[PDB]
Design a protein around this ligand. Sequence first.
Ligand SMILES: *[C@@H]1O[C@H](CO)[C@@H](O[C@@H]2O[C@H](CO)[C@@H](O[C@@H]3O[C@H](CO)[C@@H](O)[C@H](O)[C@@H]3O)[C@H](O)[C@H]2NC(C)=O)[C@H](O)[C@H]1NC(C)=O
Ligand SMILES: *[C@@H]1O[C@H](CO)[C@@H](O[C@@H]2O[C@H](CO)[C@@H](O[C@@H]3O[C@H](CO)[C@@H](O)[C@H](O)[C@@H]3O)[C@H](O)[C@H]2NC(C)=O)[C@H](O)[C@H]1NC(C)=O
Ligand SMILES: *[C@@H]1O[C@H](CO)[C@@H](O[C@@H]2O[C@H](CO)[C@@H](O[C@@H]3O[C@H](CO)[C@@H](O)[C@H](O)[C@@H]3O)[C@H](O)[C@H]2NC(C)=O)[C@H](O)[C@H]1NC(C)=O
Ligand SMILES: *[C@@H]1O[C@H](CO)[C@@H](O)[C@H](O)[C@H]1NC(C)=O
Ligand SMILES: *[C@@H]1O[C@H](CO)[C@@H](O)[C@H](O)[C@H]1NC(C)=O
Ligand SMILES: [Fe+3]
Ligand SMILES: [Fe+3]
Lengths: 348, 348
Amino acid sequence: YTRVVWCAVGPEEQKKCQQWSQQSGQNVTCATASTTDDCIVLVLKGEADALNLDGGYIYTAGKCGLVPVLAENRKSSKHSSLDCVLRPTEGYLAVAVVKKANEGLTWNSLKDKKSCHTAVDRTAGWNIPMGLIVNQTGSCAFDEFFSQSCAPGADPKSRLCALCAGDDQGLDKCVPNSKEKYYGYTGAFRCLAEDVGDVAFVKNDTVWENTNGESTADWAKNLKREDFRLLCLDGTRKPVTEAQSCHLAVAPNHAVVSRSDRAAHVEQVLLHQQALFGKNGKNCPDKFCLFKSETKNLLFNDNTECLAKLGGRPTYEEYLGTEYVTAIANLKKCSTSPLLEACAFLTR
Amino acid sequence: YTRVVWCAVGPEEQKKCQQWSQQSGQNVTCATASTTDDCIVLVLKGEADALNLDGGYIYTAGKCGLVPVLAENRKSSKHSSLDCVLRPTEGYLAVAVVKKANEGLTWNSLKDKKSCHTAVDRTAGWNIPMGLIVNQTGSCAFDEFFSQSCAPGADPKSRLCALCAGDDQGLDKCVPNSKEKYYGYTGAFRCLAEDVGDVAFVKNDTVWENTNGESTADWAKNLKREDFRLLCLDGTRKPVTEAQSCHLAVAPNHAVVSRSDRAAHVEQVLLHQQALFGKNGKNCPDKFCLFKSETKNLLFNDNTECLAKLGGRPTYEEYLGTEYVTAIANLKKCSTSPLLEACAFLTR
Ligand SMILES: *[C@@H]1O[C@H](CO)[C@@H](O[C@@H]2O[C@H](CO)[C@@H](O[C@@H]3O[C@H](CO)[C@@H](O)[C@H](O)[C@@H]3O)[C@H](O)[C@H]2NC(C)=O)[C@H](O)[C@H]1NC(C)=O
Ligand SMILES: *[C@@H]1O[C@H](CO)[C@@H](O[C@@H]2O[C@H](CO)[C@@H](O[C@@H]3O[C@H](CO)[C@@H](O)[C@H](O)[C@@H]3O)[C@H](O)[C@H]2NC(C)=O)[C@H](O)[C@H]1NC(C)=O
Ligand SMILES: *[C@@H]1O[C@H](CO)[C@@H](O[C@@H]2O[C@H](CO)[C@@H](O[C@@H]3O[C@H](CO)[C@@H](O)[C@H](O)[C@@H]3O)[C@H](O)[C@H]2NC(C)=O)[C@H](O)[C@H]1NC(C)=O
Ligand SMILES: *[C@@H]1O[C@H](CO)[C@@H](O)[C@H](O)[C@H]1NC(C)=O
Ligand SMILES: *[C@@H]1O[C@H](CO)[C@@H](O)[C@H](O)[C@H]1NC(C)=O
Ligand SMILES: [Fe+3]
Ligand SMILES: [Fe+3]
């Protein structure tokens, strides 16, 4: 079985993956599920092989035995010309973000406001913010800390899904895939933009990429960096350029995961795949660009140069950073989920 | 070692083979196995010299070091000035056949239907439709695509063999030799004919040959060429006279393969043999007919006019054509053959 079956979360991702299968002559094939958690289960069953994952999902899969194959990697300023696949990863910034126009809203007045989150269990969208809010307030009731949210993946009869828009017909509110208008990085930021929420937790890179003519997408052509601000943990606010000084935390980059018995096959298949279709591969754009989704972030984030190598053969823990595994761990004392419970024994 | 050991797949191909041998004066003798894959093995062991094979099987043979020697040739219309043996080959049209009565069945509503196949690994029966399907669908899961099938050679427990009737007894259900009621071109079309299946993947030439009194077999004589249609890629349904505009692809002709050292000897031996027992041969039908098997396509297809020579010495790759060879490799990234796996290092 040479083919690497890839896991597409949601129908929009499934289409780009169907495309990739066709271009790759079945070097890659598609399986899908509605959610990432579901996909992780296919990867476990052996029904799929691999998929690229936010660091928080990496911890879920990590727990269930899956391991990290190659990290997503983006442009760089520091050391900005060693080869992409061997150049170390620099992480990204998880930020709290607001309309500038609104005032009196700051980290310390967040309680009882309205939130937009990438989706539940994700790193910047969720794990970091809710992480801190737990440590600070000192209670496990983050489900009630904000007045309402969009938090795809949460309980959809609950308040954390109260603000989610669903798709075009409004079907499937709160399903944590790209058919939910406010899903993921761009979803969240848009939930901010349309004033459905007060704060939105995202990465620095997400505001720059959807303001000031960078997206030519109806919801975001006219958006202006000026109209937004970043809450720091100071109590303070700064514009988006000071993100380095105004960020909640540093996050580990998305990364591909698979089963260990499938890691090397997958890593190799992918390295060739990116050479074919990656940022500067033979066939991109003449044929297929693996890293472009028109700002919809499918399979991969659109600002990925290449998938890069990892020091040794790490585990979720080496890969994520021991500092983060604890932040996630401690947040997770305040809530259970099917997959961590079902897999808890593997890692005891 | 002058005798040519001929590989006969199955007992019926066996009886014919020995009659040939008795006439041959032992210039030709027979081995047998249950399948075409086993027969190749025999050749690899050198317990047999050669046999005649569908292109798909030629791929397998080729991967195992074996080479093509001469190609089946059948009546043409154009180019009819040369001798059959020196007249270049055309190659067959591989096609999808449904009953006309079953309406709303098109290339695009095949999923979950019941299919008939010549055999796993064959060209029209398998490699073509199953390659296209796999490719269009982006999924290597062909084993779950038809609700049921008769794909002789597949795993007999599985649903690709659900519809296979075996011999008169009901024994050897799904073995890919002629004993299986639904084996080969003839059997796949019959499968459709007796409404065991909805679709059937054969070649244009099979349909003609078994409708409107073409075959005086009980199951075929009453068959009526109108009652049938062809599926085209566009999505439409032409009648069987539009094979030219409603075919899936163009198949290379079957050819004889042999171990490489033995090619010329087999070539010489066979050229003479046909002169004797071929179409116009001093001894057909007085003593023996090499290309006539009573509508069973034993050893060779019953429509074979002679065995032609081939421009130069070709690789199996050159014979099959770079494009078909790619289609196959790509489809085979979803399976494993123990045979191919073996050949991958066991061959000079
Ligand atoms: C599908 O997968 C295979 C990966 O197995 C790709 O085929 C392989 O591609 C390399 C090209 O990168 C082939 O040739 C190479 O040539 C250079 C010399 O110019 C040499 O440095 C290398 O050692 C190698 O020989 C390689 O043979 C080939 N392997 C096979 C089995 O075909 C293919 O590109 C992938 N196709 C798609 C569409 O992704
Ligand atoms: C927050 O995210 C934004 C966007 O991801 C970051 O801005 C980007 O910064 C890089 C360099 O740091 C820019 O690339 C540069 O391009 C010029 C040529 O135009 C070149 O001379 C430099 O050597 C470098 O390659 C990139 O264009 C820029 N993108 C945009 C749309 O502004 C920003 O750095 C991030 N902020 C923090 C604190 O990390
Ligand atoms: C699809 O397959 C059928 C059967 O294999 C093809 O029909 C066959 O066509 C050839 C000629 O093109 C026929 O031979 C002709 O016979 C007459 C005398 O009967 C002669 O005057 C011509 O010069 C020529 O030799 C053959 O009889 C015929 N067989 C049957 C049963 O109809 C058809 O050509 C194929 N279609 C496509 C698009 O390839
Ligand atoms: C078998 O051997 C040779 C071919 O060189 C020939 O003299 C003899 O006639 C052949 N016999 C038959 C029946 O093919
Ligand atoms: C299947 O592969 C072929 C190339 O072999 C490609 O042209 C085609 O796009 C693929 N199928 C579809 C429906 O595009
Ligand atoms: Fe993230
Ligand atoms: Fe064939």
